[PDB]
Write a protein that binds this ligand. Sequence first.
Ligand SMILES: Cc1ccc(NC(=O)c2ccc3c(c2)N(C2CCCC2)[C@H](C)C(=O)N3C)c(C)c1
Length: 126
Amino acid sequence: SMNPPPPETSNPNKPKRQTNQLQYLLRVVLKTLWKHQFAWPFQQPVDAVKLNLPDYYKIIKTPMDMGTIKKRLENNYYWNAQECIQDFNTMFTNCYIYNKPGDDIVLMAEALEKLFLQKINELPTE
Ligand SMILES: Cc1ccc(NC(=O)c2ccc3c(c2)N(C2CCCC2)[C@H](C)C(=O)N3C)c(C)c1
Protein backbone atom coordinates (compact mmCIF):
# COMPACT_ATOMS: atom_id res chain seq x y z
CA SER A 1 0.00 0.00 0.00
CA MET A 2 2.99 2.03 -0.65
CA ASN A 3 3.33 5.73 -0.15
CA PRO A 4 5.34 7.47 -2.85
CA PRO A 5 7.84 10.10 -1.75
CA PRO A 6 6.08 13.32 -0.74
CA PRO A 7 6.18 16.20 -3.24
CA GLU A 8 9.43 18.18 -3.31
CA THR A 9 9.62 21.31 -1.16
CA SER A 10 12.92 22.43 -2.68
CA ASN A 11 14.51 22.13 -6.10
CA PRO A 12 17.94 23.71 -6.70
CA ASN A 13 17.50 23.95 -10.48
CA LYS A 14 14.16 25.79 -10.18
CA PRO A 15 14.35 29.56 -9.67
CA LYS A 16 12.95 31.02 -6.45
CA ARG A 17 10.98 34.21 -5.97
CA GLN A 18 9.37 36.29 -3.25
CA THR A 19 6.42 38.56 -3.99
CA ASN A 20 3.88 40.45 -1.87
CA GLN A 21 1.22 38.01 -3.06
CA LEU A 22 3.29 35.01 -2.06
CA GLN A 23 3.99 36.48 1.38
CA TYR A 24 0.24 37.02 1.81
CA LEU A 25 -0.51 33.46 0.73
CA LEU A 26 1.66 32.21 3.60
CA ARG A 27 0.91 34.77 6.30
CA VAL A 28 -2.82 35.17 5.73
CA VAL A 29 -4.27 32.51 3.45
CA LEU A 30 -2.48 29.30 4.47
CA LYS A 31 -1.99 30.16 8.13
CA THR A 32 -5.65 31.11 8.48
CA LEU A 33 -6.97 28.03 6.62
CA TRP A 34 -4.66 25.89 8.76
CA LYS A 35 -6.64 26.80 11.88
CA HIS A 36 -10.04 25.77 10.49
CA GLN A 37 -11.83 22.87 12.21
CA PHE A 38 -11.79 20.97 8.90
CA ALA A 39 -8.12 21.55 8.03
CA TRP A 40 -6.63 18.55 9.81
CA PRO A 41 -6.96 15.99 6.98
CA PHE A 42 -5.12 18.37 4.64
CA GLN A 43 -2.18 19.34 6.86
CA GLN A 44 0.10 16.51 5.67
CA PRO A 45 0.51 14.13 2.75
CA VAL A 46 -2.00 11.29 2.72
CA ASP A 47 -0.40 8.29 4.45
CA ALA A 48 -1.91 5.28 2.68
CA VAL A 49 -0.43 2.83 5.18
CA LYS A 50 -1.63 4.70 8.26
CA LEU A 51 -5.09 5.47 6.85
CA ASN A 52 -5.46 2.03 5.28
CA LEU A 53 -6.06 3.37 1.78
CA PRO A 54 -3.77 1.22 -0.28
CA ASP A 55 -5.32 2.59 -3.48
CA TYR A 56 -4.87 6.33 -2.77
CA TYR A 57 -1.85 6.84 -5.02
CA LYS A 58 -3.26 4.33 -7.50
CA ILE A 59 -5.88 7.04 -8.15
CA ILE A 60 -4.14 10.31 -7.24
CA LYS A 61 -1.07 10.95 -9.39
CA THR A 62 -0.40 14.57 -8.40
CA PRO A 63 -0.73 14.53 -4.60
CA MET A 64 -0.75 17.82 -2.72
CA ASP A 65 -1.40 18.97 0.83
CA MET A 66 -1.10 22.12 2.93
CA GLY A 67 1.97 20.91 4.79
CA THR A 68 3.79 20.69 1.48
CA ILE A 69 2.44 24.07 0.37
CA LYS A 70 3.53 25.65 3.66
CA LYS A 71 7.08 24.33 3.25
CA ARG A 72 7.17 25.50 -0.36
CA LEU A 73 6.12 28.99 0.66
CA GLU A 74 8.68 28.97 3.46
CA ASN A 75 11.37 27.90 0.90
CA ASN A 76 10.36 30.58 -1.63
CA TYR A 77 9.94 27.56 -3.91
CA TYR A 78 7.30 29.24 -6.08
CA TRP A 79 7.79 31.76 -8.84
CA ASN A 80 4.43 33.44 -8.33
CA ALA A 81 1.13 33.32 -6.47
CA GLN A 82 -0.63 31.56 -9.35
CA GLU A 83 1.75 28.61 -9.01
CA CYS A 84 0.88 28.31 -5.32
CA ILE A 85 -2.84 28.72 -5.97
CA GLN A 86 -2.55 25.86 -8.47
CA ASP A 87 -1.27 23.64 -5.66
CA PHE A 88 -4.25 24.52 -3.43
CA ASN A 89 -6.60 23.72 -6.31
CA THR A 90 -4.83 20.41 -6.93
CA MET A 91 -5.32 19.53 -3.25
CA PHE A 92 -9.05 20.24 -3.35
CA THR A 93 -9.54 18.55 -6.71
CA ASN A 94 -7.68 15.43 -5.53
CA CYS A 95 -10.12 15.15 -2.69
CA TYR A 96 -13.14 15.35 -5.00
CA ILE A 97 -11.56 12.83 -7.38
CA TYR A 98 -10.67 10.26 -4.73
CA ASN A 99 -13.93 10.40 -2.90
CA LYS A 100 -17.60 10.97 -3.77
CA PRO A 101 -20.06 13.85 -3.42
CA GLY A 102 -21.56 14.09 0.08
CA ASP A 103 -18.72 12.23 1.86
CA ASP A 104 -17.59 13.82 5.13
CA ILE A 105 -14.10 14.47 3.73
CA VAL A 106 -15.64 16.12 0.68
CA LEU A 107 -17.84 18.39 2.82
CA MET A 108 -14.60 19.40 4.55
CA ALA A 109 -12.83 20.18 1.28
CA GLU A 110 -15.84 22.12 -0.06
CA ALA A 111 -15.84 24.31 3.05
CA LEU A 112 -12.10 24.94 2.88
CA GLU A 113 -12.25 25.70 -0.84
CA LYS A 114 -14.91 28.38 -0.26
CA LEU A 115 -12.83 29.99 2.47
CA PHE A 116 -9.74 29.73 0.26
CA LEU A 117 -11.52 31.45 -2.64
CA GLN A 118 -12.82 34.10 -0.26
CA LYS A 119 -9.27 34.93 0.82
CA ILE A 120 -7.64 34.96 -2.62
CA ASN A 121 -10.48 36.94 -4.19
CA GLU A 122 -8.38 40.01 -3.42
CA LEU A 123 -4.60 39.83 -3.14
CA PRO A 124 -2.08 42.58 -2.49
CA THR A 125 -0.73 44.45 -5.49
CA GLU A 126 3.04 44.28 -6.14
C1 LIG B 1 -13.78 11.87 6.90
C2 LIG B 1 -12.35 11.56 7.23
C3 LIG B 1 -11.32 12.64 7.21
C4 LIG B 1 -9.93 12.33 7.55
C5 LIG B 1 -9.47 10.98 7.97
N1 LIG B 1 -8.13 10.73 8.31
C6 LIG B 1 -7.12 11.07 7.40
O1 LIG B 1 -5.93 10.87 7.51
C7 LIG B 1 -7.41 11.59 6.08
C8 LIG B 1 -6.53 12.67 5.59
C9 LIG B 1 -6.74 13.16 4.26
C10 LIG B 1 -7.80 12.47 3.42
C11 LIG B 1 -8.61 11.40 3.89
C12 LIG B 1 -8.41 10.87 5.29
N2 LIG B 1 -9.60 10.73 2.97
C13 LIG B 1 -10.24 9.53 3.56
C14 LIG B 1 -11.11 9.92 4.43
C15 LIG B 1 -12.35 10.24 3.43
C16 LIG B 1 -12.58 9.06 2.89
C17 LIG B 1 -11.14 8.63 2.58
C18 LIG B 1 -9.33 10.70 1.84
C19 LIG B 1 -8.17 9.66 1.55
C20 LIG B 1 -8.77 12.29 1.21
O2 LIG B 1 -9.02 12.60 0.14
N3 LIG B 1 -8.07 12.97 2.04
C21 LIG B 1 -7.52 14.20 1.73
C22 LIG B 1 -10.50 9.87 7.98
C23 LIG B 1 -10.11 8.48 8.37
C24 LIG B 1 -11.94 10.18 7.64
